[PDB]
Structure formats: C-alpha cells, structure tokens
Amino acid sequence: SGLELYAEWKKILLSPERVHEIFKRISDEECFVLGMEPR
Amino acid sequence: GYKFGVLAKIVNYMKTRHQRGDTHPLTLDEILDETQHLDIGLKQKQWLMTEALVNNPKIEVIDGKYAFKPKYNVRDKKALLRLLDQHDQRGLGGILLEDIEEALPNSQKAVKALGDQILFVNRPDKKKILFFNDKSCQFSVDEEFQKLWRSVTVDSMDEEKIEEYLKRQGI
Amino acid sequence: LRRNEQNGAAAHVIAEDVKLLQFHVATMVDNELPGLPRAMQKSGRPLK
Amino acid sequence: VPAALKRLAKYVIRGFYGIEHALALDILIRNSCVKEEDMLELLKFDRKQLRSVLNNLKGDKFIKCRMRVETAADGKTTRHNYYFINYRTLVNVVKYKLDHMRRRIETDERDSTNRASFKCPVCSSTFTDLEANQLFDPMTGTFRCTFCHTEVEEDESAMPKKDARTLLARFNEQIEPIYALLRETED
Ligand SMILES: [Zn+2]
C-alpha cells in the first residue's frame, strides 16, 4: 500500500524493521533457494 | 421566554444563588419570586417542581426543599484529601479540578497545601484531573535511564525472539 | 525523526515522520512513484 | 496473583512511564480485567488519550485485550473491549528490556575503553593513541594534526574515561528494586 506493506490472515501493518528481523534470520540455503547469492 | 427562558432563569438563578454562599435549601416559590416568574403556567410550575428541580445532579430534596448537595461539594482541604483518597481506594479514579473549584472558592489554596499528594493529569481540552498519590509502590529513574529505556524497541519484535531473549544465556 | 524517537514522541507522530521519510527516500530513488505526487523544486519543475 | 507481580508492574510503570500509564495499569492491577469504556470513564481520559496509552501497553505487550459482544436492552448489538494485564509477557518483555540495557551498557563500557585519547583543538577531532606515531612530528618534537597542521593534545583523555563511568555505574545502583522484584518473581 503506497510505500508500506500489510499482512492479512486479521490485518496488520508490516514495518521495515519487522521485515528486517525476519530476513536477518533467513539462512544461506534459503537464499540459494530464493535465487539470491548470500555473499 | 415563557417556555425555556423562565425555566432557564430558575436553573441559572438557583445555580448562581449557591455561588453566593446561601447553601440553605430553597423553594420554587422563592425562586419564582426572585426571578419574577409568578405568571408561569401551573403545568410548568409542577413540571419544574417535579423534574428540573430534582433531576439536576447537584440538587437534592431536603425536608421538601431543594439543596445544592453540601456533602458532595468539596469546601476544605480535608474533604479534598478524603474524597480523592476514598475515590482512589474504590478505584473510582480522578476528579476534575473544576468540580472542586466550583465547590470550594480558590481551591488552589487547598490543592497547593496538599501538593505532591495530588497528581494532576491534563486532558487534551486543557482541563486538569486530580488523582490521589498512593505511595504504596513508588519508583523513579534518572533522565539518562529514562532515555536509555526509551531507546529500546519492544513492539517491532517476534514473540519467538521475546522468549528466545530469555534462553540465550541458558535459563 | 531522531529527536522524536529518542524523546519518545507520540506513535502517530513518529509514524507520520517515518511515512514522510519513507516518501523522501523513495522519491530520491524514483520520482515516478505510482499513486504519489511528483516532487517539485517548489517552482513547478519536477526533481530528477 | 502474587503481590510481587503487582509491585513489579507498579514499579516499572512508575519508574519509566508517566502517571497516566501507572494509573491505567493500576486499574488493570486492582481488577484483572476492565472494559475500555470503564477505564475511560474511571480515568476520564479522552479516547485518543487512553487509546495511545493502551497502545503503548500493547506495544510492550504488558496488557492483553479481548472483545466481548452482547445485545443491549433495545436490541442493538454491543461490542465491548476487555483489557487485562499479562504478567507472563510483562516479565518476559521487562527481562528483555533490561537485558537490552545491559547490552547497551556493555557497549557504552566498551566504548569508554575504546575512546580516543589524543585530540586537535582546531578541528575538535580526537585521535586514538594508535595514531601517536603518525601524529608525532619529529621536525616539531610534538603531536600535530594532519588536517589542521596544528598541535594535538593528549592529557585531556582522562576526562572522558572518568566521567562516563559515573553515569554508567549508577544505572545498576538504582535498578536494584526491579532486580530484587525479578529475583522474587523468577518462579
Ligand atoms: Zn585538527
């Protein structure tokens, strides 16, 4: 929505920090699966 | 004026009459004379006598006359302290400063005498709410610690992390 | 935003401040943002 | 509900939050669950005034809320918001909050150990003792700044080391009531 995200199952605002926390936990293997070179 | 103007003057005169200090109970006839509305219709007299003069939150019937509820009105430091104390004990919450100032002239004298025992909350409409300072569990910290406290985020975290933060050290 | 957050300003104020910062950052990258106004140089000319 | 939990909540709210938060929390402490409309009428706060406070107590998850629905005497639907204190999440979040301060304090302590000692009065730049061989000019026989071509001082480096310790040390001294309340509530 505009420049921000929403999560709905019941709807919440998804902040960049929450996304950062989630992404920081993602592993190298998951990055390769996602097609992103972790290095 | 014969409809609302007369009854409004009854309400306004009685309300202002209390501000003069004449807390003694009054009758509609006395107010009708003081307002010169003796010509108000019989149906209006009985209606005001049975509704307007009894349903107001500050008016109570005493020995058949109407009074400004002297027990509710705060007119001294002890009453102010006791009311806030009892209200806090019962969890009733705070009381608007205007209710005391309307009851006790220059309420600030009683308020300033109690001082820190009275907690002042300012509403968005600039009105002040008075609360009892129950010192059962009191604690305060330095600005550096209040600054330190404000610096740490709490909402933008996962529940798993909130629980994980505990176990990181092995507990 | 730094002072507002460090001072612990209201959540809606900080949120609006972050929303404005988010718009400026995005605008610096791309001015052709969808559903958003063009950033003018205060004289009717859009900033590249 | 052990009194230690009530006292802990009262101490932390009064210690780091305004009386509005304490008064609002006291209601949820005096009664485990209270309606938002009741708290609103009890506190006499405005909707946004109380809601923002409740949002903060929601942000740190010190309180929980559930919605209850019933039909009024006239037949219209009614939806009341029931708020309640969650000592479990409260103790967990305060432990995190304090553990984060510990990490910040440890970071501030480590910074107090890493702070630069030499400094230039012209550009107001402080240089670490590792640069001493670079700052010392044998042509001059003294320390100088490359950017300012001016004398660099060192003896003032005692001030930041001493001063920082005073602020950081007192943090543990004052937090003692919360630590004791925590030790008493670890179960
Ligand atoms: Zn210099």
Curated annotation (Swiss-Prot), chain B:
Give the top-rank taxon of the lineage listed in the UniProt record for this protein: Eukaryota
Q: Does the keyword Transcription apply?
A: yes
Q: Name one GO biological process term.
A: transcription by RNA polymerase II
| Cellular-component GO terms for this entry | cytosol; nucleoplasm; transcription factor TFIID complex; transcription factor TFIIE complex
Keywords assigned by UniProt, alphabetized: Acetylation, Disease variant, DNA-binding, Nucleus, Phosphoprotein, Transcription, Transcription regulation
Summarizing the annotation, the consequence of altering residue 79 to P is: In TTD6; reduction in the levels of both TFIIE-alpha and TFIIE-beta subunits of the TFIIE complex in patient cells; reduced phosphorylation of TFIIE-alpha observed in patient cells
Care to name a GO molecular-function term for this sequence? RNA polymerase II general transcription initiation factor activity
Q: Please list the residue ranges the record marks as binding DNA.
A: 1-75
Positions of modified residues (N6-acetyllysine): 3
- From the Swiss-Prot or TrEMBL record, state where the protein is found: Nucleus
Q: Does the keyword Transcription apply?
A: yes
Q: Which family does it belong to?
A: Belongs to the TFIIE beta subunit family.
- Function of the protein: Recruits TFIIH to the initiation complex and stimulates the RNA polymerase II C-terminal domain kinase and DNA-dependent ATPase activities of TFIIH. Both TFIIH and TFIIE are required for promoter clearance by RNA polymerase.
In the UniProt entry, the disease listed is: Trichothiodystrophy 6, non-photosensitive: A form of trichothiodystrophy, a disease characterized by sulfur-deficient brittle hair and multisystem variable abnormalities. The spectrum of clinical features varies from mild disease with only hair involvement to severe disease with cutaneous, neurologic and profound developmental defects. Ichthyosis, intellectual and developmental disabilities, decreased fertility, abnormal characteristics at birth, ocular abnormalities, short stature, and infections are common manifestations.
Q: How does it assemble?
A: Tetramer of two alpha and two beta chains. Interacts with FACT subunit SUPT16H. Interacts with ATF7IP. Interacts with SND1. Part of TBP-based Pol II pre-initiation complex (PIC), in which Pol II core assembles with general transcription factors and other specific initiation factors including GTF2E1, GTF2E2, GTF2F1, GTF2F2, TCEA1, ERCC2, ERCC3, GTF2H2, GTF2H3, GTF2H4, GTF2H5, GTF2A1, GTF2A2, GTF2B and TBP; this large multi-subunit PIC complex mediates DNA unwinding and targets Pol II core to the transcription start site where the first phosphodiester bond forms.
Write the protein's name.
Transcription initiation factor IIE subunit beta
Q: What is the lineage of its organism?
A: Eukaryota, Metazoa, Chordata, Craniata, Vertebrata
From Swiss-Prot, chain D:
Q: Where does this one sit in the cell?
A: Nucleus
Which residues are in the HTH TFE/IIEalpha-type domain?
5-95
| Zn finger residue spans: C4-type | 120-148
Q: Which residues carry this modification: N6-acetyllysine?
A: 58
- Residues the entry annotates as binding Zn(2+): 120, 123, 145, 148
Record-stated family = Belongs to the TFIIE alpha subunit family.
Oligomer status and interactors? Tetramer of two alpha and two beta chains. Interacts with TAF6/TAFII80. Interacts with ATF7IP. Interacts with SND1. Part of TBP-based Pol II pre-initiation complex (PIC), in which Pol II core assembles with general transcription factors and other specific initiation factors including GTF2E1, GTF2E2, GTF2F1, GTF2F2, TCEA1, ERCC2, ERCC3, GTF2H2, GTF2H3, GTF2H4, GTF2H5, GTF2A1, GTF2A2, GTF2B and TBP; this large multi-subunit PIC complex mediates DNA unwinding and targets Pol II core to the transcription start site where the first phosphodiester bond forms. (Microbial infection) Interacts with varicella-zoster virus IE63 protein.
Q: What does this protein do?
A: Recruits TFIIH to the initiation complex and stimulates the RNA polymerase II C-terminal domain kinase and DNA-dependent ATPase activities of TFIIH. Both TFIIH and TFIIE are required for promoter clearance by RNA polymerase.
The entry's protein name is: General transcription factor IIE subunit 1
Q: State the organism named in the record.
A: Homo sapiens
Q: What is the lineage of its organism?
A: Eukaryota, Metazoa, Chordata, Craniata, Vertebrata
Q: Which gene encodes it?
A: GTF2E1
